[model samples]
Structures are given as C-alpha cells and as structure tokens.
Target: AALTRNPQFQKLQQWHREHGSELNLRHLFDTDKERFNHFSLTLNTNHGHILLDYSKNLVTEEVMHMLLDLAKSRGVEAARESMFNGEKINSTEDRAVLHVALRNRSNTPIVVDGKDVMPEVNKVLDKMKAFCQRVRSGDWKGYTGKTITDVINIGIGGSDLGPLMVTEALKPYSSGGPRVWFVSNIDGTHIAKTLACLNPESSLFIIASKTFTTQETITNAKTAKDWFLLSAKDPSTVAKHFVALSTNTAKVKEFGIDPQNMFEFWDWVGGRYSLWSAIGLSIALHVGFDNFEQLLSGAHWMDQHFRTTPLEKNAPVLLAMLGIWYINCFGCETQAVLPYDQYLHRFAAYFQQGDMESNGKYITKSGARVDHQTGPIVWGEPGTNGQHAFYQLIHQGTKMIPCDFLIPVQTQHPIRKGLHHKILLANFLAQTEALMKGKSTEEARKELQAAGKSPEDLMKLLPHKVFEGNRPTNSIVFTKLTPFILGALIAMYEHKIFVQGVVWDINSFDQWGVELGKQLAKKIEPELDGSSPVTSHDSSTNGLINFIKQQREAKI
Candidate 1:
C-alpha cells in the first residue's frame, strides 16, 4: 500500500484538521507553568551536556505522541536497524551507509560484506595520525627541508566545507599547528589568491577527491602542482610537497604524489558524511591528530546514543519528528538553523548542504513519485546577524518557518569574558521567546497608550506593530562548543537526517541530482573554449554561450 494511503497518515491528516490547527503555542505555555520544564530534555553525553528545548515548537504532548506513532507505523526502527547492521539501505547505489563506522572509537567489529571494516578504518586513522605527527613535529620536510608552515587543502563540496569549518572553529586551539587554507572553487582566482602569500617550499597541499577525477578538484590540483614546480624546479620534489586523500592510487602516483601518501576511504562513506574518515586529513594536520581524535570520540558518543536510545527519548528522533510535523503536517517549506555563537558562522551553511543534499527528493522507495514533501529548504546565518536579516520575514511573513536555534552555554572566546556572553545569551533566549510570544494588536495598543502616543499616531502604527507570533523554534543549548561537542552536534544532525529519510522512504545516502549539473558543465566547456559549436541547448543558454564567446573574442 502507498505511504499516503496508510492508516497512520490518514489519522495524522485528520488530527491536523481537527486539533493541530487549533493548538496555540502561547496559550499552551500560558496555561502550563511547567511547559518548558516538561518539554525540554537534556542529554548528558561524556563529551558535554546538550539541552533540547522544543516547547516553543507547535507541538503538545498528544501531538508528540502522534508523531512518534507515525514513525513506528512507518517502520523507522526497522530501517535504522538495517543501516546499523550493515544493510545496503542506500538502495539506489546498493551501498551500505556506514559513516557511523568511521567514528566508532570503540574499534568494535562492524562487518561489511562478511569482513570487519574496523581494522581497515583504524589502519587509515593510524596512518593519518602518524602523518599528522610528522608534519606537526617538523619531521616531514619539504623540498628545501624547511618546516611546512602552510597547509593548502584543495577539494570541492564536502571535502572543502567540513574541514574548512572545523579548522576555522578550532583556530584558537591551533597555536602550534600549520596555518590552513582551503581552495575549492574551479576558478583560477581562488588558487591564485591562496598561493600568493605562500612559500612553495613551506606549503603542503592536500588534494582530496575520492575518484581523483573530479573536474574542479583536479583542475585546481594541477594549478597548485604547476605553481610548486615553478618554484622547486624539480619534478621529484612533488612527492615532498603533495599528499592526497583519495582511493585512486594510480592517479595519485601519476599526479606526482607517492602512492604511499594516498589515503583511502570506502564507497560506504558518503562525501557529506566523510569528514570523520581520512577526508579529515586536513582537520588532523591543522588541529593535530589528538584533537581530531577527540572530535571522532565526540561523534562516537552521539552514535552510541542514537543506536541505543528508544525512539520516544532519542534526541535525533524527536528532532526528526518535529521536522516531519512542520513539513508533512504544517506544510512548512523551510527550516532555519540559527547558531548564536560567532565561531559557528558556517554551521548553518554546512548543514544546509548536509540536510538538503541528503533528503531533497521527490521519489519514494517503490519507484513512484512522492505526493508529500520530503525535505525542508535548510538555511540560516549565525545569530544576531540573522536576527537583523531574515527574522523579519520569519516573524511577519505568511510562510511557516520552523527554526533550530543552537547556542553554546559558555562562550568559546569571551572578549569581555562574562559581559559578551551575557549579551549573546540574552539575544539567544529572547529570539525564541519573541518568536513564540509576539505582540498582539491589543498589546501594541496598550504599549502605545502607556508611552503617551497620540490617538492619530496609535491608529497609524498599531497595525504594523502587531505581530502574529505562532512561529515555531527549537533551542539546542550545549554546555560549550568544544571539539567533542562540535562533533556530537554534527553527528546529531546526521542522525536526524537519517531518521527523516527513513520515515520519508527516501535514500538519503545517494545524490543523483548533483550529477546532472556536472554532466552539463562538461558538455558546455568545449563550446566556451571555441573547440566545438554550441548547439542542442535552449535559446537562452545558447545565447549566453555565444555572448561569452563574443566577449572573449573582442578582448583578443
């Protein structure tokens, strides 16, 4: 039977019509003095304390139960167990989604294809640790025998974003580590600008691409190699300056890297979920391997939590169900991930790709187009910044936008120490409260009258000041943003994506939509180069290519 035709789905629809629409967040809170206390749950992981306060969301005890019922009816537990047990849950690619295995610090036996993958995972991890130690201790010398002072990470998408964000977030902890830079764009300017300040002899380039054939990554890598050779004047020195995080050893050797320096990961590790794997070589190199281990240890903590916790009490399960409520029931089209800390500026962007790329699908498991929404449009900026920017639309706009507000209880870098944190904490607390309890027209009128506003001015300003505050938000407050906590936070979201995919009946691990654009870019490259006639394209695309060629020809 179809998912929409299921009895649980019908009951949810009926509930949404009969009771869900009439539930008000403000009214629920006003009546129940312990609403916040009852709804919030704090998880005490070994790494840190994480508090998930979902009281401000448009859900009550009954609604929460119904959402859990929806998950049980959809066989979410069965799907999750299959993934954990090394089943090929990613049906489209027929590969096991085992990123959780990458961070299994316990080194327990996790079998894939009748063999425990733990040994191999640990082997690469040990290699990463040894290499990082050599580089950090000045034992790994460059062509000039100078200690590597700069680390250039060249990759695109997941390889670039995750490592870059980690290094940036943990820059304070990198006092003795090499300065790390990331170049992901195919554009020459990105590489050119990055290499401008670096000494070729003192810079180490980590070329990351699973296939070693990704067009943008390869193009940027070749440019870096040429730049290095220009300074070194020795082809043999390429091995000293460059290493790779890829499986293709033959290609790495051909690209002037030693096959030994080529790190390997499996097909089971999806790109977005691979930072815990050797794709995190840059992370290890920049932050030291021990810090990276802590990161993995933190992720492992969350992985255990997700696997062992019951559905009703699981943090990821509750978050996923809340998302389902908003997207499937309330018809919310977007989710905002707003972090209150400045260090987490890229948190939203990282998860924007993580969430959207994972679950943005219209097709179901049975090879039929879905009749319901699968993923929300994930977007946000860091706090106070977002408060000034998009909070206007969120508060006043017609669309129902559910938000996740992530805040660290203790500031990583307190400029004024306690003063800055207090200010940030106040804004963090107020935004969620204001989103739930906005000013009514009557409230606005009373405030204006108290302020001694003229009757004419009150009449003119009351409508604009009155806000309809039924906006839903979840507060994810953690003890502090340590390396371990960051790892736990990322893993939490990863599990949330997995849970949503399970309930929605979509393959979250496979990304077919990202391929079409790459295919089209390759086909269009020859036209831009004047090597082939531009044809078989829409008029607008053809015109754009012709116009670009004309501009180049005129410049010549």
Candidate 2:
C-alpha cells in the first residue's frame, strides 16, 4: 500500500487541517513557560556539542506525537536495520548502502556477502596515510627532483564537491602543506587557467573516478598529463606526478600511472559518499593524514550515536521527522540550510546534492509511483550574505520555507576587535528570533506614529510593514567548527535523508535519473561535432544540432 493511503498518515493529514493548521508559536510561548525546554534537544558527543533549538517551529506536543506515530507505522527502524546489516536496501541497484562503513574506525568486522570489508577499508587508509606522509614531508619529489608544491584534483560531481568543500572548510588546520586546486568543469579555460599559474615539475595531480571513464574527469586528466609532458618531454615522468583513486587498474597503467599508486574502493561506496574513501586524497594531501583521520573519527562517533539512540532522542530522527511535518503537513515546498561560518560557504551546496540526489525520487520501494511530494527544494547561502540577497522573500513571501540555521559559538580567525564574534552571533540569533516574532499590525502602526507620520501614511504603511510571526526554523548551535564536528554534521544530515526515504517508502540509494542524461549526451555528441547526421533526434534537438554545426563551421 502507498504511504499516503496509510491510516496513521491520513490521521496526521486530518490533524494538520484541524488543530495543527492554527498552531501559534507566540501564543503557545505566552501560555507555557517551558515551551523552549519542551521543544529543544541537545546532544553532547565525543567530538563536540550541539544544541538543536526548535521551539520557534509551528509544531506542538500533539503534532510531535502524531509524527512519531507516522514513523512507527512506516517501519523506519526496519529500513535502517536493513541498511546497516547489509541487506541490499538499495533494491533497484541490488547493493547495500554502506557509506557508514567507510568511517567504521572501531575496526569491527562488518560482513557483506560473507566477506569482512574492514580489512580492505583499513588497507586503503594505511595507503593514504603513507602517501600523504611522503608528499607532505617533501619525500615525494617530482620528475626533476623537486618537492611537490601544488596538488590538482581532477574529477566532477561527488569526486569534486566533497573533497573540495572539506579542504576549504578546514583550511586553518592545514600545516603549510601543498596548495590544492580542483578542476571539475569540462570547459577548456578551467584546466588552462589552473595550469598556467603552476610549475609543471612541482605539481601533482590526483585523478579521482571509480570507473576512470567519466568523460569530464578523464578529459581533464589527459589535459593535465599532456601539459606535464610538455615540460618533462618524457611520458615515463607521469608516474612521478600522477596517482589514481580508482579501481580500474588496467586503465591506470595504460595512462602511464604506476599500478601501485592506484587506490581502490568498492562498488558499495556511492559517489557522494566516496570522499571518506581514497577519493579524499586531495583532503589528506592538503590537511595532513592526522587531520583526515580526525574527520573519520568524528564521523564514527556520530555513527554510533545514530545507531544506538532511541528514535525520540535521536538527532537524525528528530530532524527527519520535523522535515516531514513541514513538507507533508504544512505544504512547505522548500528547506533552507544557512550556515553562518564563512569557511563553510560551500556547505549548503554539498548537501544540496547530497539530500536532493539521494531522496529526489518518485517510485516507491513497492514499484509504484508516489502520489505525494517526495523531496523539498534544498538551497541556501552563507548567513549575513543570504540575508541581504534572498531573506526578503523568506521573510514576507507567500511561500513557506522552513530553514535550518547553523551557527558556531567560536570563530576560527579571531581578532582583538570589539566583539566581532558577538556581532555575528547577534545576527544569527536575531534572524531566527525576528522570523518567529515579527511585528504585528498594531505594533507597526505605533512605530509609524512614533515617527510622527499622519493617519493616512500610518494606514498606508501598516499592512506593508506588518510581518506574520510563527515562521518555522531550527537553530543548530555548535561549540566550534572542527574536523569531528563537520563530519558529525554531515553524517547527521546523511542519516536524516535516509530516515526520510524510509518514511516515504522510497529507495534513497539508486539514481536512475542521472543515467538518461549521460546516455543522451553520448548520442548527441557526434551530431554536434558534424561527424554524424541528426537523423533520429526530435525536431528541437535536430534544430539545435544543426545550428551548433553551422556556428562551428562559420569563420570569425
């Protein structure tokens, strides 16, 4: 049966229309003194502390109970166990979703298909540690016998976004290692411009791809190799400057990379989750191996918490349930993730792919199309900047956008200025508070009168200035941004997405939608190159191909 047709789901929908629809957070706060304590939850982990204050939401205790009931009716725990126990929960792909095992720091044997994968996991970690030590310690020299000065990572999508975001986020922890550059675009200028500023003899490139056949990655890798050979004049020097984070040993050797330098990961690691594997070579090279291990250690702590905690007290469970309440009950179509730390500017972009690509599905596990919405439109920028850019629409727009506001109490680049951290904290707190306690019409009128405005002006601006309070937001406050904290935050969201997919009765692992585009691109490439005629394409595609060919053949 579809989850929409379930009895508990129907009951929750009815409650949304009746009592849940008119929930006023201001009135609830006024009536109950402990509303804040009742709604908020805090979890102190081994890595860091986090306080999730959700009192500003439009949910009451009754709504929470109904949401928990919906979770129970949907068998969330069963799905979670199936995933953790390697039951091939990704039914479409017939694979176990075990990104969790990539950070299983406890060395506990996790058997998949009667084979313990922990040995393989640690083997790769040891290789990464040794390679990082060699490169960062000036022992790994270039072809001309110079220490490596620059490291370029060539990949696209998950290979590019995950490691790039992590290295940039933890720049303060870098111990003056080699500078890192990432080239993911297929555009010629991306590789050309990046290579122009670096010395070829001292630059190392890490080619990251599971299959090593990704068009963008291989294309960029070949370009970098050709540019390096231009300087070295010998193809044998490729082994000195290039390594592969891929399982394709034949291709790695064929490209002149030594087979020993090729790192491998299993098919179970999804692209988005592959960063914790050898795909994070760039991260280890930039931040040193110890900090990289700290990242994995931090994520392992969150994994234990997620696996052992009860559903009600679980961080991922609470986050996933609240998301469902807003999306399914209140009809919210979007969720904003605003992290106030400047170093984490790309944090939302990383999760935008993580969350959207994982759960943006319509087909249910039972092989039927879902009749209800599945995933919310996830987007946001860094704080203060996002405030000036799009917060206006969020403040008074007709559409309801539930926001997750993340702020750290401490700053990384602290100066002795007059409370710069406090000023940032003020904005972080004020945005959530103002979003919940907006000015009433009467309050707006009084402010206008205090400005000595006439009755006509007061009435004109009253409605325009009035803001409807009770906007929903979740404030995630952390002690500071560290490797462990970042890992835990990412794992928290990963589990949240998993829980949501479980509640919706959908498989969160397989992504069939991305394949059709790649398949179509292959067919259209020759047509655009004028090597093959556009015979079978639709009228629109045929016209575009003909035009592109015409432009290519035209003189400047």
Candidate 3:
C-alpha cells in the first residue's frame, strides 16, 4: 500500500519492517562504541566561528542517503528550481514569495515577471542607506531640532521578531547607533515601557506593516503619533519624526510620512520573511545599513546554495526533509530547537514565528485538509538554561521530541580564561550526543558498580539514571555570530520552514490566524480606554479583562 493511503499506519509499518528508525538509533550506537564521535560531522571555520555539527542526528551514512532519496523522490529539486526560476510556489496567493530576492546581494541579475528585480532591490536598499545615514549621523532631527537618538519599531509578528532578533544579535555593531525599542504586542505594557524611557524630542518611529491597516501596528503608530504631537505641540512634526516600511503608499502619506521616507518592498515578500527586504529598515537603522547588507550577503549566499544545490548536498533541504520524515512519518508532534549560545537566546522564538507561521497549516493550498501531519509543535529555549529547566522532561518524558541543538564555537563575550567557552561548547556538543547514545541498564549498572555503590542502591538509582537512548537530535556548530553569519543562519531556518511547508503542501506565506486577535483587541480597546462600558466575555478572557480594568482603576 502507498504511504499516503493510511499515512500513520504506513509509516509505522515501514519503521517496523525496514528497521530504519531502530537502526538510526540504538542499533547504530551498539554497533560502534565510537559512533557518537565518528557519526557527528562538525564543519568549522578558524575563528571558532561558522561551525555546523550535524553529527547528533538520527542518521548513519545510509540513513542520510535514504532521507536525501526521499527528497529526490518527492520533487524537492524541481520545487527548488521553480522557486529560484521565479515561478509562483505560493500557490494560494499566486505570489512568488521572493524574500530570497531581497537577499540576493550579489551583482547578478535576478529576473521576476520578465524583468530584473535586482535594480528595484538596489533602489530600495539605496533609499534605506541614505535614510539610516541621516538618522545615525544625527542629521535627522526631531520637531525641536534635537538630533534623533532613539527608534521605536511599531509592528507585530515578523516586524517584531526579525528586528528584535537582529538587534540583539548585532548589538556589538550597534554600539553607536540609535537606541531601539519594539512595540508589537497589543498589551499596553509593550508600548508603555518603550515610551517610559524615550524622550519625545529625540525619538523616531518606524511603522512597519505590509498593509497599512494592520490594527496593532496602526494602533501603536497612532499612539506614538499622539505622543509625538503632544510633545512637539504640532501634528506636522509627525512626518519628520515618523517613517514607514510599507507598500501602501497612499496610507503612509496620509499618515504624514514623506513618500521618499517610506521604504517599500514588493507583494511577493511575506511578513515573516520580509527581514531580508526593506522590512529590515529597523535592522539597517539600528546597526547601520552596511551591517544589514552584510547580513543580507550571508543569507543571499545560502539562498544561492538552497536554490542551486542538489537535495543530497543542500543543508536546509535535507534538514527540512528529515524533519518531515520524523514529524509526519514517525509520530512526533513536537520539535525542540535548542541553541547552546546564550547570545542566541531568542533564536528559538524567532524560528517559532518562522516555522509555525509558515508550516503550521493543516489544510493544503488546494483547500483540502492534508492527509499527513503538517508542522510539529516547535518550542525550545537556549541550551544550558533549558537543561536546568525543561530538559528534565526531555530526558525522562515519554513522548519523543526530535531535537535540533545549536552552538557557536566562540562566545559573543569572550571569557578571560576561555575555560567557560570550552565548557560551554563541550556541554553543547555532548548534549545531542548524550541524547542519542543513552546508557543501557547494564551500562548504568557497570558504572554504579565501578563507583562502589551497593547492588541494592544501584538497582534503585539505575532506572532513574538509565536513559532510553534512542532519542534523535540534529546538532549545529557555527562560528561566532557576525552579522553575515547570523543572516545566513536566519535564512537557513527560514528556508527550513518554507521547505517543510512545501513538502506538506501548505501555503506557507499567508497568516490569517494572527488577524482575529487583533480584531478582538480593537473591540476591547475602547473598554481599556474607558470610552465604553466593559462587558463580559468567555471565562478566561472575562477574568483577564476584569483584572486589567481593576488595575486600570487602581492606577487612575
């Protein structure tokens, strides 16, 4: 029977008959005692940077080849070719979804719709460069002629995640750039906290939304506008102090931004993937356009590789395909994206939006519910931190969550002795290895006996410490987090999300689910402002709203 006929049973049958799952896990570990060291592949650069170690995954050489074969059988190469050739893979929206083009930092021309998109990309990039130059050099002034020193980015989801992650990742480069604040959550705390520290005279706002009508973005933008007007004593100052990254030119102009100040990207760019596009204005503003371009260059390099490389050689493709195999075929519903580097603390959250928004669809583009499983529930935290926290559940839990472990060879802040760095990398590298090569009861018994534990005590502790070591993890070792490398890493994951969605036959670009909450927030905003009477809602929501209203009354 075909796998698609009864997907779950078919997959389980294959796993049982072919022994693919068992071989990759316990059998391989038993065959070679040195399997962990030998199977793990750590590709590195000299600066202890740009390292990728995928050695901890559920793959012997044969397993990897089989996974790659799955990709080839599934038309992975053809789909990749279609995307790069500017065919519309985003079938539902009939858009090209060309965030890849935004990062094509190379001089080579890329044609879309029978014309070169490179020139247009460069044009917007040049505009962003000039705008950022003015702001960073203090040439751009506020209403009171105060040089702008702070930027508040007002947008939700992609607008928040991309800029927030980039700002945190590239803070070393932003030592001289404007102070950045983000307001995405509709919760007043997100906006209030940003405003508390910013002086209106030295602050600028970058309102980002593909559609000017995004309620959360516009609500925050309006509040910021009102705040600016109250301090400047004139509404005209809104133009000088506010800019927008949006394609809706008329709305941006109506919002008082000069048309020239609006940074535009195409309809082909989805909100989640728009960081490579001018939606990255915040990134360019906070880190200088040069650093942003370096970031773009990195992603573009990966873009070229993803587009042109074969399924066997392509990193993101193989990774996504293997992930699909695990999630859809092997009854896994969750995935852990554990990054070992502390600097990349937000990396998982960044990917949460990327993967969940992109591949979290159950229905396919053709309006049919997918027969196979779609995206896994993706949730994780930074490594050592998680080890102390939820890793207990991961190690001892019944459900199998395939792990993706990440670490850079170098730390963002170098420790004096370098002992901490080595310890960090060792834990980072060993975790996935430990997850894969777990101890057998006999092995645990031997260890306990060597330590002179009595047989009675050993029996009790052995089961607790004894790991069922068939867990799978994909390890990535990277070089230090430079702007370029970070860009590549983000792009890598973005492609991972995209490919996973493709394999599952979902429309990855659209995000209709995020809109309803915004609509509800708008309906409730008047109550928060005390402009309308409060009403009851569903129990949890009603309880939260009453709490908020009570807090508001107390504050007043």
Candidate 4:
C-alpha cells in the first residue's frame, strides 16, 4: 500500500489542508498557558538530565495524536522489536541489524542464527581492553623496544568518523593515553602530513577494514608499511607496530601483521556503527578503556528507553515524527543541527552521514518506488559562529528550515567569571526564541518611529524590517557534554534515523548506492596511464580522460 493510503495519513493530509496556514505560533502560545509543559519532555538517566523541548515545533496535541497513529500503522513498533531481537530486518542483505548488541553492557544474551552472540562480543571487548591497557601503560613497544607515543588510525567513513568524533569529544579524559591521529583519505597529503610528525619507533598504525580489501584503506596501509620498513629495515618488525580490525586472518598474516593482532567485528552489525565494535580500538587508545565503557553504557541507556517507552514520550520517536510532519506536510527539505559546544563541532556532519546514508533511498524494502519523501538534507555548524554565517538564510530565506538547537547546561571551562558561557547560553536561548517569534510589522514600526524616521522613509524601511514569525525548532538541553551524555545523544539520533527509516519502509542496513562508483573507478584507472582511446563512456567522460592523457603526454 502507498504511504498516503493509510487512514491516519489521509486524515493528516485533510487536517493540513484545512488548518495549516491558520495555525499561528503566537496565537497558540497566547491561548495555552501550559503549552511547554504539555509538549516538552525530560529524561532522568544515571548520567544526568536530558530535556528535549519541542514545543517550538508546528504541532498541536491532535497533530501529535495522528502522527503517533501513523507511526503505529507504519509498524514502527514491530520493526523496532525485529531489530532488537536480532531478526534479519535488513531484508536486502539478509543480516540482522544488531549494533545494539555491541553495547549490550548488561551481559544479557542476544541470539542470532540459533547462537547467543554476547559470548563472542565479550571476548572481542576483552581483547580490546587488554590491548588498550598495554598501549596506554607504555607496555606496548616498537622494534627498538621503545614505548609507542603516537597512534595512527587508518580507515574511511564509519571506521574513521566515529572514532575521530569520540576521541575529540572526550579529549579531557585522555590523560595518559597515546596521542592519536586519523588518516582516512586516499589522497597522499593526508597520510603524508601525519607521518611527517612521527618517528617510526614511536608510532603504531591501526588498519581498520572488515575484509582487509577496501581499496582506499589498503592503499594507504601499504604506503604506511613501505615507509615503516624504510626505517625498521625488517619486515618481521611490522608485527610490533601494526594491528588490524578485520576478519580476514589470511590477509592479516600475508601483510606481516601477527594474526593474533587482528581484532574481529561480526556481520550482524552494519558498517556505520563499527565504532562500537573492535573498530573503536583507536577510541580506547585515545581515551582509556574505562571511559569507553561509560560511552557504551550511556548509549545502552537510550537503547533501553527507546525500546520500553511509549511512542508519545519516546525521545527518538517524537523527533522522528516531528521530522516526518515537516517533511511530508510542510514540504521542508532541509533540517539544521546547531550544537552550542565546540567539542561537538563534528556532531552535525556525523549525523548528516548517519541520516542521509540510511534513508537516501527511492525504493522501499519491497523494491517499489516510494510515493512520498524519505530524507531531509541535514546540516549545521557550532553556535555563535553559525549565528553569523547561515543564520540569515534561516531567518529570512523563502525555505522553511526546521532546526535542532543543542547545548550543555554546564561548561567544561568556567574561567572569566563564567562570562563566556553566559553569552553563549544567551545566544542559544535567543535564536530559538527569535526563530519562533520573529518581529512583526507593528513592532518594527514602533522601533523605526522611535529612531525618528520620516513617514515616507518609515514606509520604505518597514517592508524590509518585518520578519514573519512561526519558524520551527527543537532544543536539547543537557547537564554537560560528558562522555556518557555524548553517547546518549548519539544513540538518540541513531534511533531517530532508524524510526524514520522503519516508517518509510526503507532497508537502511543495505548500501548498494556506493557500489557503482567503485566499479567505474576500477575501469577508468588504467585508461589515464595508457594511450588507448576511451570511447566506452559517455562523450564528456571519454573526452575528459583523453584530455588528461594528452595533457600528461605534453607535460602540462
């Protein structure tokens, strides 16, 4: 059945048609004195308080009721249970989406394919903890028997982004851990610049690829080995300086890394959540293993909340349904994720990949083209900075951009009499207020008149000064950006993506979208080096390749 075919969805369409333009934010707030209390929610976890205030959104009580009905009719509840229980909800891949199991810190048994995977997950986590202790305590050494000081993490996409974001977020907790660096790009400059600052005896490289055959990861890895062998001078010494987060034991042995150094993550989990698996060795290497445990425990808190709570009070579901309303009903195309903390500068970009790669599909799980919209363009930057840059477009641009504003109630630094945080917090509060209650013509007229403008000048300036109120936003106010709270926030967003995908009937686990480009790049590589004519591609592509070859021949 089509998405719009459901009774709840049909009723929502009718409701939007009749009351959409007339439902004003000013009037709604003016009428309901307890609007915030009714619409907002607070979660008290062991870590701290998490307040998700969504009253600024364009939703009424009846609107939320129908949205929850739509979620149930879409089978979000059953879809969630399917994932949690290790059923193969990822139909296209025939694999269970079980990242939740990686963080099943409770040691509860989770079964997949007639066997409990918790035992194996525990073994791998034990291995990670032991290795992290060896490295962080200066027990791990290079060929010269010198303690390692620098660790290089090499991988692309999930393997790199997640660990990089976590290590940055928990920088303060890394007191005795080794200095960490990430090299993910296939471009030479990324690896080249990192290697320049390290001595071979003081560096360790972590190669992260599940199959050990990813083109970009292996290419950079081989280059690193070549440089390492230049100084170590013995291929046998590679075992002391290199490790792998992969499943291919044969490839690990062939690359001169001891098979014992190969850490494993299973097929049950998707690539995007690899950080929770053995791929997060670099995270443990940067922040101690104890903090990593806290990180997993924090995510587990939200996982429990999403699984047990009702849809109306659930954090992930409420956010997901809000996005659904704006996307399908209001026709908004983009959503902003503005974080007020500098440590979370990468917060928006990480979820940009998270939300888009999971739901950027045109087809449903049954392979039929979807009848409605699926994903929104997720983008943002840190506070105050974004207030100066893209805030203008969101303030006055024709497009209606729904934004999420996040800030910690306490600051990591409290210097200068807390003046910096005071100003930043003020801006955080002011933007959402200004976005929801923009200046009206009457208010602007009074302000212009107070400035002593003539009638003719006032009339000309009034049109530009009036700001139409009623933009939508959500505020996530937390106690602080501790490792646990960061983990909870990340898991909250991950579940939000899952809920939206479930409602849209997308197979969020399978990623066939990235295959075609890799396939094409394989065919085009040799053509650039040869004098052969490249006529198989389109005219523009063929012309570009031939032009590159000719330019190289002419020494341009």
lDDT per residue as tens, model 1, 1-556: 2568768877888889888878888999999999988789899986679999989988888888888888888888888888878888889999999999999898788788999999999999999999989999999999989999999999999888899888877776787899899999988899999999999999999999999999899999999999999989999999999999999988999999999999999999999998999999998888888889889989999999888888888999999999998888889889899999878888888888899999998888888788888989999999999888988989888888999998999886777758988988999999889889999999999999999999999999999998889888999999989889999999999999998988888889989998899889888876787634466799999888877777775754
TM-score for each model: 0.98, 0.97, 0.89, 0.98
lDDT of 3 by residue, 1-556 (tens): 1225434434444654577545556566667777656544343323234434455556666556656655565556777777766788778778787787888767576677899887998899999999889999998988889898888899998878888888887888887798888899977888988898999999999999888888778988988888778788777788888999888899999998888888888888888888888888888888888889889988887787687766666778867866876776677898889888776778888888888888877777668777777877888988789988998778778988888887766677777778888888888767776777788888988999999999889988989978886788887767677888888788888888877766666788877786698688777766676534355678777677777766765743
lDDT of 3 at 437: 73
Clashes of 3: 10
Model 4, runs deviating above 4 Å: 531-533, 553-556
Error in Å for residue 530 of model 2:
3.6
lDDT of 2 by residue, 1-556 (tens): 3789889889999988878758887788889899889888888885679998988888888888888888878998888887777678889989888888899998887789998888999999999999989999999999999999999999998899999999989999887789999999999999999999999999999999989999999999999999999989899999999999999999999999999999989888898888899999899989988888888988888888888988877888889999999988888888999999888999999988888998899999999999888888899998988988999888899888899999888889778763878888999999998888888988998899999999998888789999897788999999989888888888889899999999898988888988889999997776565445565788888887777776776888
Better of 3 and 4 by lDDT: 4
Q: Clashing residue pairs in candidate 4, if any?
A: none
lDDT of 2: 0.89
Which whole-number lDDT from 0 to 100 does residue 85 have in model 3? Answer: 67
- The segments of candidate 1 whose C-alpha lies over 4 angstroms from its true place after superposition are 531-535, 553-556
Tens-place lDDT per residue, model 4, 1-556, is 3576778888998999998878777778889999899899999996799999999988899999999999999999999999999999989889999999999998888889999999999999999999988988888989999998999999998878888888988898888889999999999999999999999998999999999999999999999999999999999999999999999999989999999999999987677877889989999988888999988988999999999999999999999999999998998988899999888888888888888888888788877888899889999999988888988889888989999999999998887989999999999999999888899999999999999999999999997898887998999999988888888999999999998898788887778899999999999897777787789899999999888877775843
| Candidate closest to the true structure, highest lDDT | 4
